[PDB]
Design a protein around this nucleic acid. Structure first.
Ligand SMILES: [Cl-]
Ligand SMILES: [Cl-]
Ligand SMILES: [Mg+2]
Ligand SMILES: [Mg+2]
Ligand SMILES: [Mg+2]
Ligand SMILES: [Mg+2]
Ligand SMILES: [Mg+2]
Ligand SMILES: [Mg+2]
Ligand SMILES: [Mg+2]
Ligand SMILES: [Mg+2]
Ligand code: NA
Ligand code: NA
Ligand code: NA
Ligand code: NA
Ligand code: NA
Ligand SMILES: [Sr+2]
Ligand SMILES: [Sr+2]
Ligand SMILES: [Sr+2]
Ligand SMILES: [Sr+2]
Ligand SMILES: [Sr+2]
Ligand SMILES: [Sr+2]
Ligand SMILES: [Sr+2]
Ligand SMILES: [Sr+2]
Lengths: 140, 160, 186, 154, 95
RNA sequence: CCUGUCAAACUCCAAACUUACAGACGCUGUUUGACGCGGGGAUUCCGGUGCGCGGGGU
RNA sequence: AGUGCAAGAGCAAAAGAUGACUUGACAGUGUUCUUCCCAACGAGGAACGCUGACGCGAAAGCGUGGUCUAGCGAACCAAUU
RNA sequence: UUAGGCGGCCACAGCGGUGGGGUUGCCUCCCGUACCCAUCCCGAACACGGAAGAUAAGCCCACCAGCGUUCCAGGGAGUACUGGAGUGCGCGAGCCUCUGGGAAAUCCGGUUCGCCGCCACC
């Protein structure tokens, strides 16, 4: 019961929303794996006439690659209360977002007979803080 | 122009503003009169003005009658008396006029009117027992400025 | 849900189990579907045809009933998949079924996968099914040689329950041998 | 079983109405036919409703009328008990009349014209511009009311 | 009419009621009809192909063979006999 | 929440009614041959009125 | 929402978006409906087949241009294959 | 069907909620990347290999009607509208009687928290 309910890190997405690159090199070295470009939609007056074109990049970290990053990433930002998604996620920082969820998430990500996670099984801001706080730092 | 030109319902409903342009504004200044803050149920007497024939009443007549009716209520009950009258209909029907002979005769927009079936409530006033004979008089003046004959019916009141 | 105007998906689309767009293109052939479905532990293969109140399964085979012919191995792998297909394909021949079209449901058409293995089995059983040989896994991986070589990187036994230490793709050969035999109580 | 009597002429009446009448074997004003009460026949008289006079006649009245106005399928031959006896499945007019009312046979089945060609109503009818409920002579009638008509047109 | 195209004045008949919106069930698009069978003609708004002229909606023809997968249904427009090529998707059995 | 109005180019609804096919009854056709097919000859392509439903227009 | 453009209609594991590959916007010949309700009438149009040759896909299958309804032209003569 | 696969009808099946269920069984979540295959970056997904753990998700089972929907009774209503007829009424727009049909909103109480087909299976 309690084991199949205790949270885990789904993914850690580190991204840099520039606007026009040379920044791929830093993310690659700080995360470990290979990064990916980021395009945009809708023409903007801030010199964005080319729809599909590089603006930024991101990296989705999973498993160890994610934890080994968080250990040397969390000690760099003062986490707050408001800095938490109603779902149970948080973004701080070069942005760094941590997606958290319970053991049976695959049900909503798979192809065959997928189903959305019930609100009860959906993580909570409180349950989120606790789990994280219970791992090398303080809250609020 | 005479009401003879528009009083009868003899054309299709012409109200789709998305297809009609240049429609003249409504001369009807207000629809809520008296004390619009107090409720209708806070009054012992509720007298309505009922139209006895199905007709089309132009916004000019609507304003003219609503005016001469409420202008009386003001005179008799003061500018802030304990009454509250209501004009429930709104000029939805757009009117034309073929103002060339019968060639390309579809007319231009000249006004608006409110369609009212027989037996409908054009006006409904809410007053106290004492001021009941005043509203009846305001309505007597009002039915004089609209095409049909009317009935002044007391909907809530056995004080007589 | 929301109101009267609202549109609720067809039950099997709601459930995310049936791809109706692919189903129509499938049915257009006029032949029966060789429904190839797979689970975490097992593999199923049904020879389905169309019917007035719903589909009709004329023949079928489940990896579970594979042991009934001497299968002491797991049931969610390549040799298992192929064999289940061959079994199903054989029962199909008996029921009068001679041709079919592979229906892989919501599975992906990945080269060498289990559904193509299931397909190779049914075809081998004597069924005429539109296929493409270069999308099928090579004979050895079908046998289960990929797992024996995985067990070679031992140090720790691959199989928990004692089937054997080094594993036997020869067991596959034994079973296939058993099925192709004219006798066998289907 | 009802007795239909055309009381209004063909001129100006809708074609689909005039056709229905003709299907009910009635081609002239003052002509009568005996129609069974069935769903199909009910739809037919409903359509003819405003140009006809109908209702269930009494055994007695049906006999008076058959005696006086019934004709063979061909000829002037008087339809009397003797005639009825020699050509029909009955012994007399009453026998026939009972069968018609009980809807066991028809006028054709017994070699009789399906039409009773009646005489104008003696002393006149109640008018052809109003129904029975309004003092007219059109539409459904009382068993007593229909008899008064059929007898007056004997 | 203001124009004379095939879809002229066909707003109602070629539109689905909100709840019938979306892709139609494959079953009826595959239905097999036999020669001599009486079938009702009704265009399925959700199905683009294999339609007949909207003027023939409501007819009840007689299947008299097929051309490809589509059927050849006989009908009588007014007093004139016509043959209509139509796919099962827009056909229903009578009774 | 409460309170007051509408739609030829709106519709969650929805007739009467019109309409395809078939059965039944009716009527009709098999010496008055219907239904249908083939051929000869046209006239006709200024219409009008009543009622019902209209659209334009005082 | 989007789907080139009136308006109305169709579309969500798509008819939309992205990506990649591709040239079926192919040759030949028809059936049917439309044009022209009923009911004769050309060009034009569409749906649906067959033969040939191809593209894509694991395959069923999809592609006879653009989701559907507008974007069209006789004889004579010239040019062209 | 002590949890399965494929379906038909495509909300009576939706939305939301409550309770129950799994030793070598089932479905899962689950564990794991040598392979087939995979990510414009991630064994996340897809694909493959497999059981140490779990029934908390899903799923299956039982049940609740607050919202949406289906149907039924009574009320609204034989009202609104309407096919046929009238030397019936009205200056008239229009109305009425007879005949054959007949709503919608809404009120009230019930219903509905899917039904059915095929194959497999303590
Ligand atoms: Cl599957
Ligand atoms: Cl057609
Ligand atoms: Mg005679
Ligand atoms: Mg006299
Ligand atoms: Mg008289
Ligand atoms: Mg229309
Ligand atoms: Mg010339
Ligand atoms: Mg040239
Ligand atoms: Mg539970
Ligand atoms: Mg008069
Ligand atoms: Na790029
Ligand atoms: Na002029
Ligand atoms: Na549909
Ligand atoms: Na043509
Ligand atoms: Na569970
Ligand atoms: Sr008019
Ligand atoms: Sr007056
Ligand atoms: Sr009509
Ligand atoms: Sr197309
Ligand atoms: Sr994993
Ligand atoms: Sr007069
Ligand atoms: Sr006058
Ligand atoms: Sr009734």
């Amino acid at each position: 019961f309690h084991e199949m309910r205790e949270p885990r890190i789904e993914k850690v997405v580190v991204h840099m929303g520039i606007g026009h690159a040379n920044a791929e090199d830093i993310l690659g070295e700080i995360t470990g794996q290979m990064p990916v470009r980021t395009k945009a939609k809708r023409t903007v007056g801030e010199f964005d006439i080319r729809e599909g074109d590089p603006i930024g990049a991101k990296v989705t970290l999973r498993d160890e690659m994610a934890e080994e990053f968080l250990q040397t990433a969390l000690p760099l930002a003062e986490l707050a209360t408001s800095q938490f998604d109603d779902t149970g996620n948080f973004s701080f920082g070069l942005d760094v977002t941590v997606n958290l969820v319970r053991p049976g998430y695959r049900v909503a990500k798979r192809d065959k007979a997928s189903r959305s996670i019930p609100t009860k099984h959906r993580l909570n801001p409180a349950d989120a803080v606790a789990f994280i706080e219970s791992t090398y730092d303080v809250e609020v | 122009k005479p009401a003879s030109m528009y009083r009868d319902i003899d054309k299709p409903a012409y109200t789709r503003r998305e297809y009609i342009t240049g429609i003249p504004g409504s001369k009807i200044a207000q629809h809520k009169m008296g004390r619009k803050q107090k409720d209708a149920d806070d009054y012992p007497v509720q007298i309505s003005l009922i139209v006895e024939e199905t007709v089309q009443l132009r916004h000019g007549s609507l304003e003219a009658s609503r005016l001469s009716a409420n202008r009386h209520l003001i005179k008799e009950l003061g500018e802030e008396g304990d009454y509250k009258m209501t004009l429930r209909k709104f000029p939805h029907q757009v009117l034309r006029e073929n103002k060339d002979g019968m060639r390309a005769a579809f007319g231009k927009i000249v006004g608006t009117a409110a369609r009212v079936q027989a037996g409908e409530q054009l006006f409904t006033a809410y007053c106290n027992v004492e001021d009941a004979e005043h509203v009846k008089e305001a309505f007597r003046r009002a039915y004089n400025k609209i095409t049909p004959s009317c009935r002044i019916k007391v909907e809530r009141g056995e004080e007589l | 849900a929301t109101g009267p105007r609202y549109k609720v998906p067809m039950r099997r689309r709601r459930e995310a189990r049936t791809d109706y767009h692919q189903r129509l293109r499938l049915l257009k052939s006029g032949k029966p579907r060789l429904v190839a479905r797979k689970s975490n532990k097992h593999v199923r293969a049904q020879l389905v045809t169309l019917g007035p109140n719903g589909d009709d399964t004329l023949a079928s085979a489940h990896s579970s009933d594979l042991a009934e012919y001497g299968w002491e191995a797991p049931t969610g792998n390549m040799p298992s998949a192929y064999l289940t297909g061959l079994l199903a394909g054989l029962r199909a021949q008996e029921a009068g079924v001679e041709e079919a079209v592979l229906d892989i449901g919501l599975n992906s058409p990945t080269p060498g996968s289990k559904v193509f293995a299931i397909q190779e089995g049914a075809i081998d059983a004597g069924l005429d099914i539109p296929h493409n040989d270069d999308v099928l896994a090579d004979w050895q991986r079908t046998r289960g040689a990929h797992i024996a070589e995985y067990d070679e990187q031992l140090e720790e036994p691959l199989y928990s329950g004692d089937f054997d230490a080094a594993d036997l793709p020869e067991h596959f050969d034994e079973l296939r041998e058993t099925l192709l035999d004219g006798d066998i109580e289907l | 079983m009802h007795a239909l009597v055309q009381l209004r002429g063909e001129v100006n009446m809708h074609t689909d109405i005039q056709d229905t009448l003709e299907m009910l074997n009635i081609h002239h004003v003052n002509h009568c036919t005996l129609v069974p009460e069935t769903d199909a026949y009910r739809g037919m008289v409903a359509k003819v409703n405003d140009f006809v006079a109908f209702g269930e006649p009494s055994q007695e009245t049906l006999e008076t009328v058959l005696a006086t106005r019934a004709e063979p399928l061909e000829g002037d031959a008087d339809v009397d008990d003797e005639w009825v006896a020699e050509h029909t499945d009955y012994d007399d007019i009453s026998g026939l009349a009972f069968a018609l009312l009980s809807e066991e046979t028809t006028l054709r089945e017994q070699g009789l014209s399906p039409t009773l060609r009646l005489h104008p109503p003696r002393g006149g009818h109640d008018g052809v511009k109003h129904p029975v409920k309004e003092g007219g002579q059109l539409g459904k009638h009382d068993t007593e009311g229909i008899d008064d008509l059929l007898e007056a047109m004997r | 009419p203001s124009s004379n195209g095939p879809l002229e004045g066909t707003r109602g008949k070629l539109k689905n009621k909100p709840r019938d919106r979306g892709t139609s069930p494959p079953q009826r698009a595959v239905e097999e009809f036999d020669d001599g069978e009486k079938v009702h003609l009704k265009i399925d708004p959700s199905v683009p192909n294999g339609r007949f002229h909207p003027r023939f909606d409501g007819q009840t023809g007689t299947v008299e063979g097929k051309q490809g997968d589509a059927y050849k249904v006989d009908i009588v427009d007014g007093g004139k006999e016509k043959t209509i090529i139509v796919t099962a998707a827009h056909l229903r059995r009578q009774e």
